[model samples]
Target: TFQPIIFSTACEQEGVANWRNITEALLKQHNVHAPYCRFGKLEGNFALNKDKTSQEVIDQLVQDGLQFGESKVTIKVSEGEALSKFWELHGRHYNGVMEL
Candidate 1:
C-alpha cells in the first residue's frame, strides 16, 4: 500500500512531465490500470466490457443511474480504494502526472 502524491516544489519539477511512461508502467501493476491508449468516452466506449467483475462496476460506467460520475469506474487491487481516492482527487491533489 504505497501512495505518493506529486510535489512540484519538492524536487525535479522541470522533469515532471517526462515521468509518465514510468508512471504508466507502475500503474499497470496497479489494480485500476489501463491507458486504453486510444480510448475515450464515446462510441467505441460502449463496445467493451469489464474483466468479469461486479455488476455495480458495470452499472457505474454504462448503465448509469448512479449518484455521481462513478460512471468512470475501474476495478483495482486495493478494492479500488486506491484508484477511488485517485479519482476523487483527480485534479486537486496533483493536477496531472509528470514524466522524465
Candidate 2:
C-alpha cells in the first residue's frame, strides 16, 4: 500500500539551515523517497513503498527523531491529521512525480 508521509522542517521555529540535505539523508537512510518542496517553507510529503507500513515508518522515525541543527524536524503518517493539513495548504498538486 502507498502511504503518504507529510513532513516539516520546523520552519515555524528558527535557525534551521540546509533542511533539505538533512531531510534527504534521513529519508534515504530509511529507504523512502521524498519530493521535497517549500510552498512557503520546507514542507511536503513522501510516499512509502509497497513493503513498508505506516506503523513501521512511524516507529523507525520515532526511534531516530530527526534534528535540523538546533531544531527538531516533524513528520506525520496519519492522513486524518497530517495529510489534512497538507492538503489544506497545497491541495493535491505536486511537481515531477516519481515512483519508488
Candidate 3:
C-alpha cells in the first residue's frame, strides 16, 4: 500500500472524494506504478485515504498526516519505523514552533 490506511466504501465523507482526486493526480504525475493508495485513518474532513492496495512504493508524500495536524502513519513498516525513530529525536516542540 502507498499509505498506512485505506478509505473504503464504508467511508462516506466528502474528504475521501477530495483525497481521491488529489492523490490520483499526484500518483499519475509521479509515475506511481501502484494501482491505488491505502490509508489508515480519516481525521475530520480532510484526511487522505489509501488506495485499495498494499504494494510497496516510494510515494511522493513520505509523511502526510502532519498536514492535518494528526498521526504520521505511513505505508510500510520500515517507513513508519524509520520515521518514528527520526521523530523520537525531535518530537518535543517549543511554543514558537507553531502559530496560534
Candidate 4:
C-alpha cells in the first residue's frame, strides 16, 4: 500500500534542512522499504510492504516529532480530504486569489 504522508510547508521553507534526506533516513532506520517512496514539492507518500504496517511507520514518524531543522514540521497520514483542501488553498493562493 502507498500511505500518504504530508509535510507542512515549514519543512520546505528557506533555511530549513533538507526534509527529503531526513525522511529517507528515518524510513531506512525503521527498516522500511525506501526505493518505492515518492516525494513531491511539499508532500509525499511512503511505500508500505510486508516489512512494516502503515500504523507502525506512522507511529514512529510521530514519535520522531517530524522535525526539520529548527522547525517542528507537521505531518499527517492518509489524509486525502485534508490534502485536497490544501490543493484548493494552494491553487487559489498561487493564482493571486488569496493572500500568502
lDDT of 2 by residue, 1-100 (tens): 2234555433335445344565476666666655543423454344444344467766776556555666666654545676677656655453333321
TM-score on alpha carbons, each prediction: 0.21, 0.51, 0.24, 0.43
* Alpha-carbon deviation at 17 in model 2, angstroms: 4.0
Report how far off residue 8 is in candidate 3 (Å): 15
Model 4: residues with Cα > 4 Å off, grouped in runs: 1-23, 63-65, 79-100
lDDT at position 9, candidate 1: 10
Off by more than 4 A, model 3? 1-19, 39-60, 63-100
Q: In candidate 1, what are the lDDT values of residues 28-65, reduced to their tens digit?
A: 43323432211122211111114533445444433321
Error of 4 at 39 (Å): 2.7
For model 2, where is the 10-residue window of minimal lDDT? 91-100
Model 3: lDDT equals 0.32
Better of 2 and 3 by TM-score: 2
C-alpha lDDT of residue 10 in model 2: 38
lDDT of 4: 0.47
